[PDB]
Amino acid sequence: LALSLTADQMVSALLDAEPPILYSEYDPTRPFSEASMMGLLTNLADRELVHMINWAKRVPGFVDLTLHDQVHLLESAWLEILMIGLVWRSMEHPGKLLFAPNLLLDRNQGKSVEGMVEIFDMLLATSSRFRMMNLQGEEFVCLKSIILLNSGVYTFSTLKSLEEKDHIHRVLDKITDTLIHLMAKAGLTLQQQHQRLAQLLLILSHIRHMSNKGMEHLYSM
Amino acid sequence: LALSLTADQMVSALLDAEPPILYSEYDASMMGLLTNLADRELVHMINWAKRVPGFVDLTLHDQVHLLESAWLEILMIGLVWRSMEHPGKLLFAPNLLLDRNQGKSVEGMVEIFDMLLATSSRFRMMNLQGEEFVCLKSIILLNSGVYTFSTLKSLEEKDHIHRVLDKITDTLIHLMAKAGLTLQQQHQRLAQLLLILSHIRHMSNKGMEHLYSMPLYDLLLEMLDAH
Ligand SMILES: Oc1ccc([C@@H]2Oc3ccc(O)cc3[C@@H]3CCC[C@@H]32)cc1
Ligand SMILES: Oc1ccc([C@@H]2Oc3ccc(O)cc3[C@@H]3CCC[C@@H]32)cc1
């Protein structure tokens, strides 16, 4: 299956699987009248969640897992995925978070709700780091997919377990390769290739932290 | 400074910097025992941090913010490490080896416990080396609060940290190149190891919510500030 896909096929698939960029729902006319910040953000996240699933299903090696396992991986990584998506489209908007093309917010607008400025600042911080690293879209899609498969993978001791975890680690290893390949093609030396790799995979650690803070908050609202 | 250290010098330093293994004070409260343990370790953690190549070259405020941000992750990867040869148990101390069950003793601890165990297994399953361990522990320190620090001094710092991090990334690969792994095997195990830090982050988060439900920066700074 995915295990036989070539670097260029893996990327290609990943780029194809990309979900559309949704808009924030709201009648522009009248005001901004606090029109519930969470309201707008939550509603946006809900509609994206759907498109996220069809996406997951197209991530090479994902469908080959059991249904219970597909649900546990998504449940475990939906916010991380939503965030890396944000952080990605907010790259060309230093100081702002492009939640939607018609909903670009700034650090300030984040103080509107309690607890949201810290998160906001973290997302911004991350968006900068990606811009500073000149993250490519091919690299992005890879990371997004590594998140899906690596997030809930250590929270799955039956035998069925084993078989599954092996497949996941093989897809992950397959993506790690794809990434290196993307960097080898871009002209980076070997040492440069694994340094950027470590840098990118260490950013996911931050995106994990953000998802955690994002959920405590969600559980507080 | 550290930026000129060779792979073998980096590792060597790291191995030397290793803190001692403390005992649980007792012959009783679970959190009590665990908390008291974590407190005494915290001291030894600082002396350690100070010996991580490139760390002391940062400002005091930055040293305190990195540790404050990664103390629990560090304590945990340490646990997960010594609990490698005790499948099904967490070797908090040599005289305090607990099992999943004893974790149900306190509310909210069994989930944590199961995550720690799950991780401990993954390390055992990967046959993680001690040289690789010390590297990871050090990558945590430097990478944890690095994205929660915009001045100029600020830019100087982040660059140094990303350089030490890159230096360690190298050391790791070197460790794997020496062990016989192919190039592809070298970067795969790298990605696998670095992805486990993401989990160790998640565990530190859960560990703090739990801690929170039952003042450190001033406590760590009182320590880092030596004469
Ligand atoms: O595509 C995306 C990406 C992200 C989001 C919002 O991110 C936040 C950031 C900071 C917050 O205090 C809340 C939120 C919303 C709570 C979960 C996600 C949602 C929507 C849509
Ligand atoms: O070296 C270590 C490493 C780790 C620990 C314990 O980790 C926990 C894990 C899960 C918990 O519900 C509580 C704790 C204790 C509360 C802070 C840390 C302490 C002690 C010593």
How would you describe this protein?
- Two copies of one chain form a homodimer.
- The first copy, chain A, has 221 residues and is mostly helical.
- Chain A has a single domain (1-221), classed as Retinoid X Receptor (Orthogonal Bundle).
- Chain A is built from seven helices and two strands.
- Chain A has a two-stranded antiparallel ribbon with strand order 1-2.
- In chain A, helix 2 packs across helix 3.
- Chain A is globular, with a radius of gyration of 18 Å.
- Bound molecules: the ligand Oc1ccc([C@@H]2Oc3ccc(O)cc3[C@@H]3CCC[C@@H]32)cc1 (2 copies).
- One copy of the ligand Oc1ccc([C@@H]2Oc3ccc(O)cc3[C@@H]3CCC[C@@H]32)cc1 binds at residues 41, 44-45, 48, 79, 82-83, 85-86, 99, 116, 119, 214, 217-218 of chain A.
- The PDB classes it as transcription.
- Keywords: Nuclear receptor ligand binding domain, transcription.
- It forms a dimeric assembly.
How many beta strands in the DSSP annotation of chain A?
A: 2
Physical arrangement of strands within the biggest beta sheet of chain A: 1-2
- Rounded to the nearest angstrom, the radius of gyration of chain A is 18 Å
Largest interface: A-B, 35 and 35 residues
DSSP strand content of chain A:
under 5%
Structural class of chain A: mainly alpha
What order do the SSEs of chain A take from the amino end to the carboxyl end, as H and E? HHHEEHHHH
Q: State the helicity of chain A in percent bands.
A: 55-70%
PDB class: transcription
Keywords: Nuclear receptor ligand binding domain, transcription
Assembly: dimeric
Entry title: Benzopyrans are Selective Estrogen Receptor beta Agonists (SERBAs) with Novel Activity in Models of Benign Prostatic Hyperplasia
